[PDB]
């Protein structure tokens, strides 16, 4: 009744025949022989991540799946900076669940491939479609570890893929059911799920204004969606004292660009701006699942970027809440706006490392597309902690500058302090770090624009085609060896 | 943030 | 034709939805008693569940409106009536989607689905043809603000269909998809709905003929006879599954409001339109091509033009005697 | 040793079971019912052009793919204008054919699926690839019909879809290749291969100057790529003085715009601008394989347009062979300038019908996309034949207007007898035609513009991505059928 | 609708 | 011909 995923090895030059993992080889030997007898009929060795399917094997099993996993003993690839042998198993095992779902079997136990982790990543990370909204739909699949040995590693490979498909949750839904007010309330709720050493705040406007946060409201203004503040504390530490390490991801519910208003194509991608905010939100969810033991505060601002008869004029001048006056030159990066009150603010927690995630600019994107998110920091520390994070999800980021140059085509404004673009369309990406570089103090901070990594088409084999909730595995990672240190 |  | 002229080229400032809604009102019940007219206000249309044409209305200040119109006709008052639908934006703007100023002012003619399918109706109420004919045309303006349709939202059409509003200037078929749908409740022997509705249509035929795009050949050839001696032509357009599987190919929502491709808008745009008809006697006319003369109609001067109100009416007139 | 494909039909109310074709049932007889036992265990029922692949049934076939037929009575769809039924059978069977190609097997014998032509032509169109210039290829598939009773109207689909796969070659071929001369060498050998009744005049540039083609020079003049009037004569009447056919294609082997210069984005597609010439040379290659007992001529002026220091200026004013003049406001405005002079022409041989197609203008895939070649025509009968003959082959056509209004659009013109380029942006596909028509005076003749039938993408089910040929099979049909009047 |  |  249920479909089963099974892996394959490549081939090595000293074995006769490709062999399977444990559990193929066990399945093998429950069928008398017939999987290997019919997997050699079928033809071509199975490459890695490809597929074929074999019917009634078993009585339990009519349909079963075998995966390429590439050579079993792939391990870090230096000219790729990930673990090839992790990221082979993650899209084999994703390419079977498929299968099994197209077959419209709602069940599947999987094979854990050596590394159970990444099995689980491949499959939850495989099957997910944000489908809520469709009368049509695929059926929905409910896959388990094959076998009881690897529970903690599947586990936390369905924990690791939950977060970051909450994360393409939140991303991928259109703009006007995500508000800033629902965003807030989905994150409530999942972290309140996730451990009870939580408070969230959903701060209104209020409080905004109160805050002097006139960089943030300035954005705000010109849609009539009420804006908030989420902030959100997990208490994991022992010590309640212990200095929280502080994320702020940019909250964006629907960036149409404002009076410097965007072209119509694609523009509905834009329902994903906030998936800085997303990936943090999300990551911290993750790490209270994990009962991590350290102290986190996550901290978004969200409204929308609209066009109207209130919104953001270019020229504008604006006050950022450490007293800075910012020329808005153009009101579609806004991005840049929003976060420099909530950089400000991070700094109030005391914080150990400041780490901000942003869909920031496009230029990031003409830069390295989706191979990688951006990384400017002040602290090769930290840049080598998410870089080491990084290798082990697949889930890769790649060091970006942060050079006085760049700071000083921010810093050249007619009217005021600092100027929201730059003085020329070259590096966009850097230019946009070093404007939110004035609003840091703090010697650990990272600032990771996303934008290039906001949407999948088919660059990664296990996520369908849709928001991509990259990179919200590496930053839970990141948070995990952190806290064994 | 376009380009420009 | 004329009233339909003067209500595409009235500028938007004073041709509101309420001030078409009245002025149809006027002519008609001037023609005929045998007629009931509902200015449908917002609370109607919100009742009615119509949450496609809710969204594109809700990003401009001016009030929607409902238009409902009912020619009795018919010696039997029980006898199904033709029901006509027709896209009333008055003006379009794109909404955040927005439209390059070049030649925008045309725009407070993108209620000339409505202004034909309404003029048409009076006319045949002034003819006395002896039919029962009602007439639909949801009215308001497309236009961007704080609160405005934003590319990707998802909408609820009346059917509960869900539709994801890549482009809020592929607007003309999210308000026709609710209007279609309470046409059906009628138990209408025909549909017949006109718009203004894709700048394709006007790359396709340009203003040599309005194109119809239906699911009966009777239907077409009762539309191409009567354009034949009213000389105000009509050009068939095709409506194959090939198109809808380019707005059904969505990734939020049950059909998508501007295809994948480029190709075919106006095909596509009747596509998407389909999928809110079960009705087998339906036809859509894309009249943005006609929407205008210059010199191409020697009898037109320049202008909007209040095409093909006359062929509509001489095929209410043929209908009516079978 | 090799693969079989198998149809099988969607389950009608009154039936316990889908049915397989007669092939299908036989075959399952063969496995002592093990075909019928493994698709029970393997789950849904096989919906129309969906497959799935079975193994080791039989050891003379380790692959047998069944592929849904849909509705085993599907007929003539009135809402689609097309044959249903022989459309499912070649989406099905492409469909299968593929799947044994990406399980590497060299050989696969095919079931008619109760239409072998349209078996056949799923088999040949859905296999066919151009990769003649990349050493990565894949396996070379070699299909059969399974069985030997339908072999004529097997052979019929197989020389049908050669004669597209032969445009689909002359189009996808990269134009340095694919110059005027190599296209009418290319077309010679095959009409040649095809019959001895044939003669071929390669025509040089002095005979386009003697024969007073200045619209045509014209445009050639501004590549250094010699220009050719290809001439093919197929002499199929018993009687030698019966008057022919006459085809006629547009074959700019590559279209930059010239001065009127094109923008780069998918600007390569552009090799395909000599469609036009493809289609109605290989259907007149198709006609002389099918010994169709009638007169044909085939006329393709072939040149490049490119700009240099001597092309095409706007506003530059040419004589065509009629003694018209032309004023060429838009030098991208080609095609119909050399199918003027081609046009005058082939009233030369006082033809029966004149059928030109040109990939003529960006109009008509705004207008029609891919969905249908559009059809101009002075003759309903004419319409009426194309129209019918597509219906059979489902690569259908949509007929558009030749009215006096889109005349006067181009006829409007300030130096010259006839303008190039409409007074207005509407309509562009409608007063192209126009053009067209003002070198005509023959009662039958229609205009087919194929520019939005150009490529595939995955809107034709059994072709690959790619230049698409159409309506190659439309034409051939129409010829067949003329000859049995 | 824009083309597009 | 492109338009326009
Ligand atoms: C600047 O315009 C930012 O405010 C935008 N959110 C950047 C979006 C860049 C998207 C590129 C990948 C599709
Ligand atoms: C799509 O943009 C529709 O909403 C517009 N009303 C189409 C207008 C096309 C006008 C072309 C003729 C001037
Ligand atoms: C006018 O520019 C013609 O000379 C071109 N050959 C038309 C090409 C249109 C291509 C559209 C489909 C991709
Ligand atoms: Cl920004
Ligand atoms: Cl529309
Ligand atoms: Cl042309
Ligand atoms: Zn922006
Ligand atoms: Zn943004
Ligand atoms: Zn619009
Ligand atoms: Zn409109
Ligand atoms: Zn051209
Ligand atoms: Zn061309």
Known sequence: TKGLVLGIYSKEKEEDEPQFTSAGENFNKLVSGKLREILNISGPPLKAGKTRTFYGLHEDFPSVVVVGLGKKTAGIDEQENWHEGKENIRAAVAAGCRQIQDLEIPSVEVDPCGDAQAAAEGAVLGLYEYDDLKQKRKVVVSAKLHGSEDQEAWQRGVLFASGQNLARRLMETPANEMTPTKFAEIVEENLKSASIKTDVFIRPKSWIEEQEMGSFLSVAKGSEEPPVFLEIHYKGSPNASEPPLVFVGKGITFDSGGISIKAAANMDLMRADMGGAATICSAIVSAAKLDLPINIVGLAPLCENMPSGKANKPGDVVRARNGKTIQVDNTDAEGRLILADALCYAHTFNPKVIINAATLTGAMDIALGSGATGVFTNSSWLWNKLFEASIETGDRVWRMPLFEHYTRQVIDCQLADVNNIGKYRSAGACTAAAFLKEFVTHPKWAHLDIAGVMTNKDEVPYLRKGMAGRPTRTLIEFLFRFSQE | ?4
């Open chain 2, 1 to 4: 943030a376009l380009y420009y």
